[PDB]
Amino acid sequence: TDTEERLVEHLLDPSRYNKLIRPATNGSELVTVQLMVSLAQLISVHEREQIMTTNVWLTQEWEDYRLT
Amino acid sequence: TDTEERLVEHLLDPSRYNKLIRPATNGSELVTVQLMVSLAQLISVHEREQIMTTNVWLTQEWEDYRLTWKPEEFDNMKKVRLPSKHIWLPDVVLYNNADGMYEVSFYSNAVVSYDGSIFWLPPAIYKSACKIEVKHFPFDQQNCTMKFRSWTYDRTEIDLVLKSEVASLDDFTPSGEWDIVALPGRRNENPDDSTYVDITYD
Amino acid sequence: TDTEERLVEHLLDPSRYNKLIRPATNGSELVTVQLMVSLAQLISVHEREQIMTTNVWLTQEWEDYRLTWKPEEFDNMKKVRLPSKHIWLPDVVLYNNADGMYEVSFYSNAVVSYDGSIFWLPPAIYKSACKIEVK
Amino acid sequence: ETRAHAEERLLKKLFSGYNKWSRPVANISDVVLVRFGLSIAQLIDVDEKNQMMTTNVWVKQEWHDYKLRWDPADYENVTSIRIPSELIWRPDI
Amino acid sequence: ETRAHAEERLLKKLFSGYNKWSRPVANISDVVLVRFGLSIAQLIDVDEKNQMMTTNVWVKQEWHDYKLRWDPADYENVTSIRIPSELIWRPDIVLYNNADGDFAVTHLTKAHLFHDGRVQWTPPAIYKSSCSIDVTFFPFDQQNCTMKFGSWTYDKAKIDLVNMHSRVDQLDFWESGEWVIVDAVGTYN
Ligand SMILES: *[C@@H]1O[C@H](CO)[C@@H](O[C@@H]2O[C@H](CO)[C@@H](O[C@@H]3O[C@H](CO)[C@@H](O)[C@H](O)[C@@H]3O)[C@H](O)[C@H]2NC(C)=O)[C@H](O)[C@H]1NC(C)=O
Ligand SMILES: *[C@@H]1O[C@H](CO)[C@@H](O)[C@H](O)[C@H]1NC(C)=O
Ligand SMILES: *[C@@H]1O[C@H](CO)[C@@H](O)[C@H](O)[C@H]1NC(C)=O
Ligand SMILES: *[C@@H]1O[C@H](CO)[C@@H](O)[C@H](O)[C@H]1NC(C)=O
Ligand SMILES: *[C@@H]1O[C@H](CO)[C@@H](O)[C@H](O)[C@H]1NC(C)=O
Ligand SMILES: *[C@@H]1O[C@H](CO)[C@@H](O)[C@H](O)[C@H]1NC(C)=O
Ligand SMILES: CC(=O)OCC[N+](C)(C)C
Ligand SMILES: [Ca+2]
Ligand SMILES: [Ca+2]
């Protein structure tokens, strides 16, 4: 939609949103990231090479005050 | 943080910082680069092909006088991360590699201090050729070397120096098939070249 | 030379030449592309995998009316080399390839004549799938 | 007048204010119907020991973009064009 | 006054109107003389079964660009600079008899540019070339594997190659322990 395109252009505008900078309001503030691993499939275990191959969906949740 | 965005925009402003120019002024002085290899893991030593695969961090430190700021003017900010691809880097690579992979693997961010000190710690996966001594196999001890040079600048432009005399094992995971004995580092010049310098780890 | 670089800037000027648009002229016409494969070496035939590996030079020729110039205005230059990545190419690929590599390997220059003739001869290492008869 | 010039004008018009990150629907409640199909080029391998199938397929997709419409009468009867797929919104199948 | 400012001024002046897609000759009839040489870092693998040789070489190239010239007196006595090789014109030297590798150089290191227009570009390259393998006297066999280098789209009237040195440079060679290089000479054809 026109509104969605307008919002996406507003949010990602490189003029006002720098994607290389941590979204911390204060210098000493820290960003909390929530992690959860979903094991979709254990593809293999290689005893000789000592490697486990898995298919996992890695949930990651945090807050970005600049994307409001 | 708005202050960090302002500082990052100020430091890398193209009108005042060009990454194609080596940070050496008042004549062609030397940019001293401190090297320190930290061995994360000894992946393998394929004896048949004579290739040792290692996972290391190529710690590098130098001084860029163009990346300084006053902490008082930036909310007392004394360090900032800058993308390594946007600042001048000493193109230190693995010269004695096999498979022709010279550069680091990721090109991570560099940590800049307010006095112009750059601290870069990129990860690298290196497949270095080494000479296999088969005389005492299977009770054999191997001496595989990794030679580091800059494939851009010679000794007259950058000086390679050793941060410490041994490679660091602060974040090492034992291999299970090979046992680390010693990881000394040495800085090698050439008495009859004056433009050659390399740092080799045994 | 100054004239050569002037010509190159004039031809590839994005404001007048778009490389995403087919050089079709006279209406809803079609661009005729001439192919010629030159076998430089039969690197290998892998019977167990049923893959043939060849080193070939793939001659591709077509006419782009947008890359025309008058030799008089450009110091009587009759042809120039243009980077093939900056002109319209017919996306000619090897369909029956194995290993999922469709395009040519190098992307050399394309030799462009003053009348719009384009001569492209890139080298390629191709791995094609073929049916091995074991009888 | 030439088809190439009309196509250049059309390309300028279509992507003037186009956003490739926004779902291409005129109304938020609308659903993008993606006609999906597979055309198998070859069954490269069936690795029984590792329990994997390697296939070479063509992933046929087809949707509608409401901001990529035009009248061919205004562009020398240009009815369709080939554009890089990285310039437009695509489903993330 | 400082060298960095002079270098910035020089870099701005050089690339003001520089076209990297144009052969760098003042006169169209002029030939770009490219001095070509090889330096073998190591002989990674000789594959008798597949008839391929893998080498780690440094492709030493040197030519003249008439637009990348300056007077060092006007730039704080700056006599040379290192510039990315993707900013300038380079010859398209490729390995004809490639097999399972890359035809052209892909590393694209920085080029050493001198005040008189000379450009030295010495990128590394891993090449996997084809060579016929003669195993009549195996394991006492001696192989003769060749590498053919030349520009792909510029004829002799536009780019000409010059042997920097007869013999392939072996000063930085990594001895393999399986093969010894009896002879390694480049021949102009
Ligand atoms: C592992 O391999 C390296 C490289 O082959 C060996 O390095 C070499 O070691 C010898 C003996 O220590 C060095 O010779 C000595 O150099 C010193 C320093 O100038 C000199 O004072 C002595 O008179 C003698 O010439 C040699 O320079 C050195 N070469 C390199 C390139 O480092 C190393 O010894 C081997 N280590 C083990 C445990 O096998
Ligand atoms: C979008 O669709 C909903 C559901 O039919 C409708 O209520 C709404 O008015 C539509 N919006 C517009 C702008 O037509
Ligand atoms: C437009 O082109 C189509 C073919 O794509 C053709 O069938 C139709 O008759 C043409 N119409 C006009 C007005 O040229
Ligand atoms: C280029 O060289 C040719 C051959 O000597 C000469 O005839 C011609 O005048 C030269 N062009 C210029 C502009 O000097
Ligand atoms: C310029 O630098 C060169 C070394 O690159 C030196 O030999 C020469 O004396 C210098 N000239 C001046 C005027 O400083
Ligand atoms: C090696 O091959 C080259 C070209 O094929 C030939 O000129 C040369 O004489 C050969 N040398 C030997 C020792 O066979
Ligand atoms: C013009 C052109 O691209 O020629 C390529 C083939 N070669 C190197 C034999 C001339
Ligand atoms: Ca199988
Ligand atoms: Ca071998």
mmCIF file of N, CA, C and O and ligand atoms in Angstrom, chain C residues 57 81 108-109 111 119-122, chain E residues 94 96 150-154, ligand 7:
data_model
loop_
_atom_site.group_PDB
_atom_site.id
_atom_site.type_symbol
_atom_site.label_atom_id
_atom_site.label_comp_id
_atom_site.label_asym_id
_atom_site.label_seq_id
_atom_site.Cartn_x
_atom_site.Cartn_y
_atom_site.Cartn_z
ATOM 1 N N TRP C 57 35.498 -21.153 -26.233
ATOM 2 C CA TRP C 57 35.306 -19.734 -26.477
ATOM 3 C C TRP C 57 33.968 -19.567 -27.181
ATOM 4 O O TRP C 57 33.778 -20.086 -28.283
ATOM 5 N N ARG C 81 36.755 -0.946 -27.661
ATOM 6 C CA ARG C 81 36.489 -2.015 -26.711
ATOM 7 C C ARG C 81 35.631 -1.468 -25.584
ATOM 8 O O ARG C 81 35.959 -0.435 -24.995
ATOM 9 N N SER C 108 35.037 -10.905 -20.761
ATOM 10 C CA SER C 108 36.004 -10.057 -21.432
ATOM 11 C C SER C 108 35.305 -8.842 -22.038
ATOM 12 O O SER C 108 34.096 -8.650 -21.900
ATOM 13 N N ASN C 109 36.084 -8.000 -22.708
ATOM 14 C CA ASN C 109 35.519 -6.861 -23.411
ATOM 15 C C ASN C 109 34.736 -7.327 -24.629
ATOM 16 O O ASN C 109 34.889 -8.450 -25.110
ATOM 17 N N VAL C 111 34.062 -6.094 -28.563
ATOM 18 C CA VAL C 111 34.585 -5.211 -29.598
ATOM 19 C C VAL C 111 33.412 -4.644 -30.382
ATOM 20 O O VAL C 111 32.654 -5.388 -31.009
ATOM 21 N N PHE C 119 30.937 -7.726 -31.158
ATOM 22 C CA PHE C 119 31.620 -9.010 -31.244
ATOM 23 C C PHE C 119 32.141 -9.350 -29.857
ATOM 24 O O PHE C 119 33.049 -8.685 -29.352
ATOM 25 N N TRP C 120 31.577 -10.386 -29.249
ATOM 26 C CA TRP C 120 31.946 -10.822 -27.910
ATOM 27 C C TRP C 120 32.447 -12.254 -28.001
ATOM 28 O O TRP C 120 31.815 -13.091 -28.650
ATOM 29 N N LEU C 121 33.590 -12.531 -27.381
ATOM 30 C CA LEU C 121 34.207 -13.856 -27.422
ATOM 31 C C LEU C 121 34.772 -14.230 -26.058
ATOM 32 O O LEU C 121 35.986 -14.343 -25.883
ATOM 33 N N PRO C 122 33.909 -14.454 -25.066
ATOM 34 C CA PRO C 122 34.404 -14.779 -23.734
ATOM 35 C C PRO C 122 34.817 -16.236 -23.639
ATOM 36 O O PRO C 122 34.233 -17.106 -24.308
ATOM 37 N N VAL E 94 45.081 -13.065 -19.518
ATOM 38 C CA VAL E 94 44.400 -14.254 -19.026
ATOM 39 C C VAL E 94 45.244 -15.480 -19.334
ATOM 40 O O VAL E 94 46.119 -15.464 -20.200
ATOM 41 N N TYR E 96 45.346 -18.850 -21.009
ATOM 42 C CA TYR E 96 44.597 -19.525 -22.060
ATOM 43 C C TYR E 96 44.223 -20.938 -21.643
ATOM 44 O O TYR E 96 43.049 -21.321 -21.691
ATOM 45 N N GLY E 150 48.274 -14.141 -22.160
ATOM 46 C CA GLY E 150 48.145 -13.114 -23.167
ATOM 47 C C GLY E 150 46.901 -12.297 -22.931
ATOM 48 O O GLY E 150 45.977 -12.726 -22.238
ATOM 49 N N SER E 151 46.895 -11.104 -23.515
ATOM 50 C CA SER E 151 45.706 -10.269 -23.479
ATOM 51 C C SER E 151 44.602 -10.910 -24.303
ATOM 52 O O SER E 151 44.864 -11.579 -25.304
ATOM 53 N N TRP E 152 43.359 -10.706 -23.879
ATOM 54 C CA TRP E 152 42.249 -11.406 -24.505
ATOM 55 C C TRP E 152 41.634 -10.622 -25.655
ATOM 56 O O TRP E 152 41.196 -11.227 -26.636
ATOM 57 N N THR E 153 41.600 -9.291 -25.576
ATOM 58 C CA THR E 153 40.869 -8.486 -26.544
ATOM 59 C C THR E 153 41.706 -7.415 -27.231
ATOM 60 O O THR E 153 41.179 -6.719 -28.102
ATOM 61 N N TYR E 154 42.976 -7.259 -26.876
ATOM 62 C CA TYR E 154 43.848 -6.268 -27.491
ATOM 63 C C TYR E 154 44.922 -6.973 -28.305
ATOM 64 O O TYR E 154 45.686 -7.779 -27.767
HETATM 65 C C1 LIG F 7 38.499 -10.389 -29.539
HETATM 66 C C2 LIG F 7 38.476 -11.433 -28.479
HETATM 67 O O1 LIG F 7 37.850 -11.380 -27.465
HETATM 68 O O2 LIG F 7 39.258 -12.466 -28.790
HETATM 69 C C3 LIG F 7 39.308 -13.540 -27.816
HETATM 70 C C4 LIG F 7 40.094 -14.727 -28.321
HETATM 71 N N1 LIG F 7 41.560 -14.500 -28.604
HETATM 72 C C5 LIG F 7 42.329 -14.245 -27.350
HETATM 73 C C6 LIG F 7 42.109 -15.723 -29.259
HETATM 74 C C7 LIG F 7 41.740 -13.341 -29.525
#
